Ligand binder design. Structure first.
Ligand SMILES: N#C[C@]1(COP(=O)(O)OP(=O)(O)OP(=O)(O)O)/C(=C\F)[C@@H](n2cnc3c(=O)[nH]c(N)nc32)C[C@@H]1O
Ligand SMILES: [Mg+2]
Lengths: 406, 553
DNA sequence: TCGCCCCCCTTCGGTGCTTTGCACCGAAGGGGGGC
């Protein structure tokens, strides 16, 4: 087959990211995986004259107890030419986020049948480490379209369209969306019925080469004001400061007469009664915060941003936006392991869940602002990652000015 | 000999040409020395004479070798290195003896003239040109180029390492039950074979290396313990570091203290309890490597402690994969931590220390978490797994920390060990305001252009105070205002500020800070019985906040 | 008068914040050690 000519964006060089340490289990898995792919010509052993590198690690699901190799091509994807500019990219269907159930299938293996522009392969180098540095690193570069590279779905585009062509007309009410190495496929059947059609697709795919999502249970959680009969100065101070922040989001919110109530240098535990003029103010502000904000629409040409806050006892609130204070979506994630002991595992799971919802809804992941120290996140996150994609993220230390979302 | 291994193709950076640099110490002794070295190298085909059509040049020199009676040759390729292409280095770390498993039979060998046994790519040789002068400049001079990896070139280590890996891989695949540690030209070979058979595999390995052009001189062939390896001594049951000699001076310069700290850090991998914080302090605010620095009293005590630690003999043991790894941390004070990693009690695999201050404001629980993360990473590098931890922090303390701290945090499976001083939270902010406690509405403002500010408060019981501040910032004024409330209040206090900044610092329960102002606030928070710290938005006429707002003008 | 790697401690300068200094972070200086 002919290679598609691919290029890095003007004035950019390939990734030069160091490999991080990996456990024994993952090194062994990466070597058995890479030894075979070398044998099948999918990758070639290289040396140090290739100046590029990208971290590699491995993930194992508990519904799929085999190791899956994962190359963190985030830096390479950033520096790769856009394929929307070349009109090879994938359009997102607005229909998926409505469906009863959405299953995710890893079709990254399909990319291994199409060669990569030989002049671009050097940018795909990665290095397997060794326990106790018994040996130098062993380096490989791809010869095929790599899993995790954003150009692979774009180049395989018109091929995937042919593979799914029959399944699509035979099932016109199922919607398929390809994102990276994944197929997001949703329908409105009974779970049993739906699953069945999935195995059909699987076996059709299998001829050539996790768990059910449910979009309609992704309830938005809004900004709710407490309900009390007696209000202390402090209770009102928190309420005023909470509605004051919200005035940057919502419109026509007032503190004129709740702020009046704090008149004087009062003790924080003193119970101030509530005027009609201020009781009107609150119940007015309550409704404004009940049903969502008018004037916020998705822009596909801007980045998606996600902010997460730890609320304790297993709860995590999150907001997705493009312009600050114009949230496309607010939510609240909740844990699942039966011990409620591990914050980093919960945050890692929350990030995958939020990112999955963005793919389902908008077709791309957000850039995460993670409420965690960089070095704590990097010490543990790979142990809980289960997705074939990895979103962008940055690390924030923002104390809760108010418990806005709780 | 020169390996028949295929060359590694190398390039210069795009747009750049080769070096062109003239020659130094044109002495006669040196010239004759240089023609003597080069003629033997030339006879073995390591270098070749070149003429004036090659425009490039680089200068030459040579230093001594640790193995006495050998000189080492070096060419100053600083310029060529700048123009040579980048390499991805495949040496990802340093093997450690604690990662070794006990072996029945062990051998340590080394390759002779390692770099000079690897050919250099044909097209790149002309850039390694160096002229040898002529009689202190009388005539044009003798030129050579390298045909092999030169010492001093940026690409030589990586290209050798890669070449050695290719050469050993046939032997590795064939003998998986032979552990080979490959560090540059140094090979450690361990096995559970009986000595007679082990030796068969050795000369089988040596003969394989020689087919590919790698000699293994008897001189560097270690057949008997103790083995000298990577700066350690390998015994059958244990390992030592080669002796570490610290400088002893009457008058210390900055540079000697730098040397001292470096030795102590190297020693801390097996010598438990090493501290360098007071010795490193001396290095701060200094401005010359030759600057004489008088040791503080604290630095003398720390060195004395370290010297007594180093006087006693210690050894590490080897790794048993059938037993768990255990990591025990102790707190040493002033942000210093020391740890031991072991599998059976009182038999350390290695030790170490953590003493970095991350952030301007932190506490012992955060630093403990960072120590655990450092140890966790080290254990992955050496043993491929993390250890079980024994930590001097109570479960109540940790659980209080991660329920009241807003950032996700975590520590693996750990077991409380009672080795005082324990790691504790030194104060906890009340989640709710305190009945009966005085309420302080604090605020402080500084004029960005002026340098002048005020800090003060107004209270529900009727007290007021303003302090003028000079040479301050706006964030300082707000910390100063909280400082006054804590100073003039009783054991229980409610405080209202409009500084998200100050609230952010304090709500993280720091117990140490680079700021002396924050340090003072911490000392006060620890003396208090109950503190509630609430925030409000400024300039929105809140009762109290507006009162003190108006006053601090 | 040289090369490559890991570690620690200090300093410096770039980044972003609904900032005006501040906190964070990575790179570079010194030292240790390896070959
Ligand atoms: N490979 C290899 C060797 C082995 O160095 P090593 O002590 O083992 O000696 P050797 O192999 O040259 O020969 P020998 O073993 O004595 O018979 C090296 C590292 F491992 C390289 N190298 C060592 N030190 C230095 C050094 O300071 N400056 C530079 N620029 N390069 C060095 C060159 C040498 O080739
Ligand atoms: Mg040698």
């Amino acid at each position: 087959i002919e290679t598609v000519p691919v290029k890095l964006k003007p004035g950019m060089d390939g990734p030069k990211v160091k490999q991080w340490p990996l456990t024994e289990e993952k090194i062994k898995a990466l070597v058995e995986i890479c030894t075979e792919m070398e044998k099948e010509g999918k990758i070639s052993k290289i040396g140090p004259e290739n100046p590029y590198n990208t971290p590699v690690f491995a993930i194992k699901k508990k519904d799929s107890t085999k190791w899956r190799k994962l190359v963190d091509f985030r830096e390479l994807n950033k520096r790769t030419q856009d394929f929307w500019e070349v009109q090879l990219g994938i359009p997102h269907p607005a229909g998926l986020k409505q469906k009863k159930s959405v299953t995710v299938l890893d079709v990254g293996d399909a990319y291994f049948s199409v060669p990569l522009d030989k002049d671009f392969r050097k940018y795909t180098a990665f290095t397997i480490p060794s326990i106790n540095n018994e040996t130098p690193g062993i380096r490989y570069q791809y010869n095929v379209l790599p899993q995790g590279w954003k150009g692979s779905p774009a180049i395989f585009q018109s091929s995937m369209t042919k593979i799914l062509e029959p399944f699509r007309k035979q099932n016109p009410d199922i919607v398929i969306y390809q994102y990276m190495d994944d197929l997001y496929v949703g329908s409105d059947l009974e779970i049993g019925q739906h699953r069945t059609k999935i195995e059909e697709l699987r076996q059709h795919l299998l001829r050539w080469g996790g768990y059910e999502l449910h979009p309609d249970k992704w309830t938005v959680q809004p900004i709710v004001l407490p309900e009390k009969d007696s209000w202390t100065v402090n209770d009102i101070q928190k309420l005023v400061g909470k509605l004051n922040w919200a005035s940057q989001i919502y419109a026509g919110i007032k503190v004129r007469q709740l702020s009046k109530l704090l008149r004087g240098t009062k003790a924080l535990t003193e119970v101030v009664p509530l005027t009609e003029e201020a009781e009107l103010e609150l119940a007015e502000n309550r409704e404004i915060l009940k049903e969502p904000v008018h004037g916020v629409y998705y822009d596909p040409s801007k980045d998606l941003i996600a902010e997460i806050q730890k609320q304790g006892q297993g709860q995590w609130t999150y907001q997705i936006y493009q312009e600050p204070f114009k949230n496309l979506k607010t939510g609240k994630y909740a844990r699942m392991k039966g011990a409620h002991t591990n914050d980093v595992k919960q945050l890692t799971e929350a990030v995958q869940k939020i990112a999955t919802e963005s793919i389902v809804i908008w077709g791309k992941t957000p850039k995460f602002k993670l409420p965690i120290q960089k070095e704590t996140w990097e010490a543990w996150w790979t142990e809980y990652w289960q997705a074939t994609w990895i979103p962008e993220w940055e690390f924030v230390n923002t104390p809760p000015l108010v418990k806005l979302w709780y | 000999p020169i390996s028949p291994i295929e060359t590694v193709p190398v390039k210069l950076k795009p747009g750049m040409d080769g070096p062109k640099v003239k020659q130094w110490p044109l002495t006669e002794e040196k010239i004759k020395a240089l023609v003597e070295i080069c003629t033997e190298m030339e006879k073995e085909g390591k270098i070749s004479k070149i003429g004036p059509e090659n425009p490039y040049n680089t200068p030459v020199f040579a230093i001594k070798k640790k193995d006495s009676t050998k000189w080492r040759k070096l060419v100053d390729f600083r310029e060529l290195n700048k123009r040579t292409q980048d390499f991805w280095e495949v040496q990802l770390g340093i093997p450690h003896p604690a990662g070794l498993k006990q072996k029945k039979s062990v051998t340590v060998l080394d390759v002779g003239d390692a770099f000079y046994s690897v050919p250099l790519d044909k097209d790149f040789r002309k850039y390694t040109a160096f002229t040898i002068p002529s009689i202190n400049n009388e005539t044009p001079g003798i030129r050579y180029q390298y045909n092999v990896l030169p010492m001093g070139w940026k690409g030589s280590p990586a290209i050798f390492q890669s070449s050695m890996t290719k050469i050993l891989e046939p032997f590795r695949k064939q003998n998986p039950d032979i552990v080979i540690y490959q560090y540059m030209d140094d090979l450690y070979v361990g096995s559970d074979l009986e000595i007679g058979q082990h030796r068969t595999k050795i000369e089988e390995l040596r003969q394989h290396l020689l087919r590919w052009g790698f000699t293994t001189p008897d001189k560097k062939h270690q057949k008997e313990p103790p083995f000298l390896w990577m700066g350690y001594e390998l015994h059958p049951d244990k390992w030592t570091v080669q002796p570490i000699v610290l400088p002893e001076k009457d008058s210390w310069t900055v540079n000697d203290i730098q040397k001292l700290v470096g030795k102590l850090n190297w020693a801390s991998q097996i010598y438990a309890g090493i501290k360098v914080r007071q010795l490193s302090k001396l290095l701060r605010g200094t401005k010359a490597l030759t600057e004489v620095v008088p040791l503080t009293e604290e630095a003398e005590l720390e060195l004395a402690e370290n010297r007594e630690i180093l006087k006693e003999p210690v050894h590490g043991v080897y790794y048993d994969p059938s037993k768990d790894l255990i990591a025990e941390i102790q707190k040493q004070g002033q942000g210093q931590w020391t740890y031991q990693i072991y599998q059976e009690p009182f038999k350390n695999l290695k030790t170490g220390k953590y003493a970095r201050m991350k952030g301007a404001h932190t506490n012992d629980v955060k630093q403990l978490t960072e120590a655990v993360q450092k140890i966790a990473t080290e254990s992955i590098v050496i043993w491929g797994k993390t250890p079980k931890f024994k930590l001097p922090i109570q479960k109540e303390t940790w659980e209080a920390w991660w329920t009241e701290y807003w950032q996700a945090t975590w520590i693996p499976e750990w077991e409380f060990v009672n080795t005082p001083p324990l790691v504790k939270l030194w104060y906890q902010l009340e989640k709710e305001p305190i009945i009966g406690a005085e309420t302080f509405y604090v605020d402080g403002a500084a004029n960005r252009e002026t340098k002048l500010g005020k800090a003060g408060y107004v209270t529900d019981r009727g007290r007021q105070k303003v302090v003028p501040l000079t040479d301050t910032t706006n964030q300082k004024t707000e910390l100063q205002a909280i400082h006054l409330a804590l100073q003039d209040s009783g054991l229980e206090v409610n405080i209202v500020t409009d500084s998200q900044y100050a609230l952010g610092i304090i709500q993280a329960q720091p117990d140490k800070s680079e700021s002396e102002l924050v340090s003072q606030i911490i000392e006060q928070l620890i003396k208090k019985e109950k503190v509630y710290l609430a925030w409000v938005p400024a300039h929105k006429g809140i009762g109290g906040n507006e009162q003190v707002d108006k006053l601090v003008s």
